[PDB]
Amino acid sequence: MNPFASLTLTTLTILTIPIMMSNSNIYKTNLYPNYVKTTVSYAFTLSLVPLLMFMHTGQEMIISNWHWMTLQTVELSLSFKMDYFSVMFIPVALFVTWSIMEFSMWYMHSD
Amino acid sequence: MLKIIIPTTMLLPMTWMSKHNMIWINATVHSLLISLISLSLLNQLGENSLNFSLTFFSDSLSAPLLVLTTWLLPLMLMASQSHLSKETTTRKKLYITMLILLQLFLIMTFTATELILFYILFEATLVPTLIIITRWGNQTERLNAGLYFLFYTLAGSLPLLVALVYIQNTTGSLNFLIIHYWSHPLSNSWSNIFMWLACIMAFMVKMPLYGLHLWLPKAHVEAPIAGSMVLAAVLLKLGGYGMMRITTILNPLTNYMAYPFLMLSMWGMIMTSSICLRQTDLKSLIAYSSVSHMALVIVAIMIQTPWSFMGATALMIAHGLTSSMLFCLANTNYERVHSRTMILARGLQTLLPLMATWWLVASLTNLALPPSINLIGELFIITASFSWSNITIILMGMNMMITALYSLYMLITTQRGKYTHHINNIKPSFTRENALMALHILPLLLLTLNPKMILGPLY
Amino acid sequence: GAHLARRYLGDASKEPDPLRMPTFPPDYGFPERKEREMVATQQEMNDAQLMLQQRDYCAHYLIQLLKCKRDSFPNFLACKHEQHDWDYCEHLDYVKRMKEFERERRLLQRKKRREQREAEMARG
Amino acid sequence: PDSWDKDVYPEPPRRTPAPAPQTSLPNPVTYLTKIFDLLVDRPVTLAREFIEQQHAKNRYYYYHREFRRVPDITECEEKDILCMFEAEMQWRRDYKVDQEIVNIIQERLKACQQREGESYRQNCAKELEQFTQVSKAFQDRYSDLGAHYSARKCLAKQKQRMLAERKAAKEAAAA
Amino acid sequence: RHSIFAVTHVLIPVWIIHYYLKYHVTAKPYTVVERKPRIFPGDTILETGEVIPLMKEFPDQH
Amino acid sequence: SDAPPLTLEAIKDRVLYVLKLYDKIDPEKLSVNSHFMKDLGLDSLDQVEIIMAMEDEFGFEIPDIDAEKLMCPQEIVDYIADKKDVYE
Amino acid sequence: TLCLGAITTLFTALCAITQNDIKKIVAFSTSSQLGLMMVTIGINQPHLAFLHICMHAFFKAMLFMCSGSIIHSLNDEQDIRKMGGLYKAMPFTTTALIIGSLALTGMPYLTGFYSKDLIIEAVNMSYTNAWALLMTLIATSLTAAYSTRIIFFAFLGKPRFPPLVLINENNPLLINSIKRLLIGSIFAGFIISNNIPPMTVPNTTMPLYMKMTALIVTIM
């Protein structure tokens, strides 16, 4: 159903996997920078799809998935906005970050 | 709720009946079990409090404090078994007895349904803390500190007792439920003004207020590690709990009477935040940070709005945990270097990386980083104050900046830079210290996952 | 721009005020003025959800351009006639606004000169 | 779905346009949607079918608690503690229900804003009017009680408001 | 093992997120809200089948 | 990758390369132990210029103190070797 | 907001046209671009500001990466007074920096055109503060003024680095990253600008002396 929400949330969720894996036996090896770069590349090419959906049909959404807490009449929930700005700036930021990480794999080789 | 009180009174003799080399293990294990049992009071009705008997009752404000105390005792036991290694068995058992008695008095204080019993236990908490400070300190100033820590309390709390009995002679009862249900307004008269002052001043000096805070740096510096933990984490919250319980009868005199205290709290929060910057000691900085946070809590309680009450409860719990962790972190360095100067040991990140991580996390939680409960309480208090008056934000905003500054300042002075080139006895961190840091820090994040447990009865 | 130089360095009463304008009746020197025609109705503009600033007398070409852009999505270079039509309609609106500005300016200067001439005649 | 009630949370009939392509180029979002369907939507649907099959083999019911009606604080004697306790509990329950009503109206308003896109200012101003009425009523009910609120304080505030209204009406009748 | 990274880093998270959004987030009202799609004069609505009218035959100049 | 592991031979070669290329020193008369004042005929300003040339050649600045007392090429190469931590 | 953006961009460009540290120059450059973005917001053109963000990210990141490559090549040297002729020693980074600088200055058909040109046109034809417009134009001139300073002092002339030459850029990671950002800064402006719906009424009737004023100030 409506892959917009699933893809928009997945492009943000899969960015946290290497952070969770920062304790396994991949963070102590030399393959971690390439792993993070590959994860960012995959996130970018996955986020390229909601951009296409928006440029086709102009689709925007809000996803209030987790209800955090309610203080009297005020309610605070985990809500994400997927309007033009977000779905347009996520791919650009991911592309720039991928390029910067590829550059850093060479610039920080002696760190 | 005797299922929590009795196990402490059983912790006493089993501590006194344990083997010479097994006191710490038994004490830690059974204190952790008691904390796990006390974790069952978090199930609170939204309508009214849990009234177990005619003497003990639990509210949504009492339960987080009880859990904090019961969780505190094992941490104090873990932190105390380093500098007490050379002590004799009898004196170790006496130290554990003082800690157990303090926890028992705090538990019976936070749940007493009658104001005179609450006062009796809230004053009975003075003896073990004074004994600990003046017997197991390190410097010659401890005695003086103890004297201050006594009299600054008693001179503020002896009038309260009179007020209390006077109330019992007028209304006819001091039970909290009857007091709340039969509450009546207080007229504007000098007699009622002095009644307000008598009822307020004890909890004001127990926070403490800006003008009455002189005892806190002495008590928190010359005390041993466990004394500092219990003073900065739970013993300070007694004043806030007492004010939140006692302000019910003080209306409507509070709106007129709160101006000097609010002004003092705001300006003293600014002043103590500024003082934290130019500090040559390490424990005094944490003490003054505690003073600033408690001044914010005082403002929240004084403005007397539901959002302010929620923020006050959250900030109380968060500050207790954070100050305890900071004191433990400072104590580790003090044990390494045998001095309290901040600039003595520098660049400890290159020597103790995991301790550097713990320092970073503690400093981040100290400056109200989102979405930690520290920021939740601070922001609720700030919003309530802004509703009270739109200018207050300025002062609040100023404090925030200064707060971050001094926090990072400390994190930069002790951890970053280069080492001192002549301290060669910095051994690698033990498992005990890392475990203590983790047990301090993990509950903060677990609570920020589910904040409604620490937002008090106004939720 | 030169209008700013004339207004701020010369005579302010000879130049129109962009804030309060027009200050003359719309039928002062006109024998008949036809009401400006709006093609799209309110419901169509509401359904298309253009904007609150794109709902001018030019909105019909904008709606057509948005539609033709939406159907011809994969190739984004198929919308040139509609874009040019919308730009031309915008240009016509802009030249209408310039006409109004010039009309108000010369109307104000003519009125002031006529008042001065009448005062000079009445001086005798 | 069938979980919530469609009258408490209303929505427009969801008119959506039909695809009317004017080019022979392969539309990429259609292919991507088909791939996403075939690769993601089917396994999750099968997993949900299995989980619902397991749930159907063991189903039990939980009931929404229904509370009686007890005398309120207006018909409570001054020093009769039991009736005051019952009235206070009932008033607190009513306060919580009132807050949840405000929450429902605010959720309606948020759906109003998000769904109507650019023309939100005009399409669903009815939700704005409903929220204005609800907020005004809630304010007049529980505005300035502050902390340590009680049924007696709300009753006193209401009595003051009715006295002011009566005085205003009597003064207006003398015009 | 050539492309198990995609199935272990993309397919599993998207499966979990799609399940959680489809059967838990959607089950509550006003959780996933989409702005109403634009309707232009000429398109036909799917469910109703009605077709919107052309916009007043506006005059053109080459 | 990064710079090669600079050695004493390279340091001496570069120092003699810049020094024998100085126009106030005969290339056929200077040696490793050639004192600047004694058997080369130079004043303090020339030694300052030589130190600055060394700094520009090796990309690091020698402080004014510890530069007044580098009076022969061997001393200069020894100072550079001690600062850069070279073995051979 | 408009006044703050104008003063920020003008002051930052004026400080940039003088710095000797290349990283400082590009930092003042991005600060001036942020000031221009706030100017765009102040004249009620939020979508133009967002488009400027999207376009600026590409070539500013590429310029920083080129500066970092130059720094790493010359043994971590950042002063432009000690970097001489790198036009032929580092050809790929020279090409990338030239393209990025031309895009930043507003080359009439690069990724920096579809944003900066529209921003300048909108500022010219709006009921705005005259002083803010003047500062914006002067900052537009100073942008090219500091860009040509970077190019001239970093790639033209004669070498000034230490004699031991370690200039080496034949590493696939750096080449690939710079190549991707170069393709972006060349084509992404045209691709994005033609694929989003019209979110504002365009400026269609303009005097010729105001339509091309951005080019005039850049060339000056």
Add this chain to the structure above:
Amino acid sequence: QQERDPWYDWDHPDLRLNWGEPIHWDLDMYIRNRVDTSPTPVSWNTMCKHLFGFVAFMLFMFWVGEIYPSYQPVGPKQYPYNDLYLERGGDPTKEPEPVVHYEI
């Protein structure tokens, strides 16, 4: 502490302090992570004058440009339905004053 010689072999190189020498009363303020009193290429009371003059001139010029704005020789923008009365807030039960725009 920044003015102290960086090339001296200090006992504490970061603080630039030797062991045993008297410590300034305000050392923690001058730790060079903080307030710096090093000499400046431009004298004080000259940097202050230049900076204050620049900021004051900028503020005054902004103010004078606010009351002498810049615009284009165009009339007000025209909108069809009473300046979009129904869409700019609504109130559809008041029949506002008609706003008529004529051709020109």
Add this chain to the structure above:
Amino acid sequence: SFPKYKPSRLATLPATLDPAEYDISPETRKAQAERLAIRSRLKREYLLQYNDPNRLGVIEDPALIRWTYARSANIYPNFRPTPKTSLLGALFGIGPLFFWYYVFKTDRDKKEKLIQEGKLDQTFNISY
């Protein structure tokens, strides 16, 4: 000739521009020799302990202890109530309090008066 450089509190005079060093004297040379001797003796005392293989611990610096003691505990015994200290204490400890009290009291009085009149636009103020 050239514009003179005048030092300030936050921009001190450079060593090269100080007349105090060009005016040499045998007394100044003796003073510099004594200062160098003191510094060298302190450095030798530090280095003898620093390089000692046997010692393992912190080298106790009397200067640091003296500085902390002077900054923390030696202040009150050396305090005398003087007009300067009395005025400064009264000002810096009372004036801000009274100023903030007046500001907040004026603001709250204006707000309460506006509330009593009924002109404040309090709509949607559900949470306080």
Add this chain to the structure above:
Amino acid sequence: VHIEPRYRQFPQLTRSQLIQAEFFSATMWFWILWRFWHDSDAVLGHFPYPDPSQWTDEELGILPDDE
């Protein structure tokens, strides 16, 4: 690839980097020229700016200082 230092000599270049840089500069210039050839208006404008002074007095509806 292995690149050795030069010590006052021009660094050893490679054919690959040279051809890459030349190709990218050439494609940038080709794109610029193509866009100018196809969309020159975006630089020069598409619609002429009318001269306000050259509008006859009648279409603006004014009377010649008579009434």
Add this chain to the structure above:
Amino acid sequence: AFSAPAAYLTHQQKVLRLYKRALRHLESWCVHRDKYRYFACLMRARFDEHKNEKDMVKATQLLRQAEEEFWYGQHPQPYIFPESPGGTSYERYECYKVPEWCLDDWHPSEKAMYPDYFAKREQWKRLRRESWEREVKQLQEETPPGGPRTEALPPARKEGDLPPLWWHIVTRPRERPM
């Protein structure tokens, strides 16, 4: 950074330091090499003009005027070497220099790795322990009763000794440890 300073700077040292500072700032002003050579030759001629002055008062006055002129004409942003006290990478690697005594706290499982290195370290420690007493005796014998007058240290005089106070100078971590 290695040689102990003196109680004062002589006139020659002051003028040489001024000459070096002036040349560095002139090179900062004159970016290109040929222009820098031109103006450095001019500066050298200007310094050599008063080379043989014997009036100490006049020389001191000339130095004072020259330093005032330099302070007026100094570059606001002089070129600084990357690893100089003002450089962009001054203290960059101070976070990697771990003191050697930390190796004494390693776990035996960690010392199981690198056995030869720890054997060599044990030899070095034994040498230091043996030589310390001779070092301190030589230091106490070679000093005036009123303590040292300067920060310089004597060398090893007989064949069997090492220079006094050598352990922490020899065992510096590295210039680039990691």
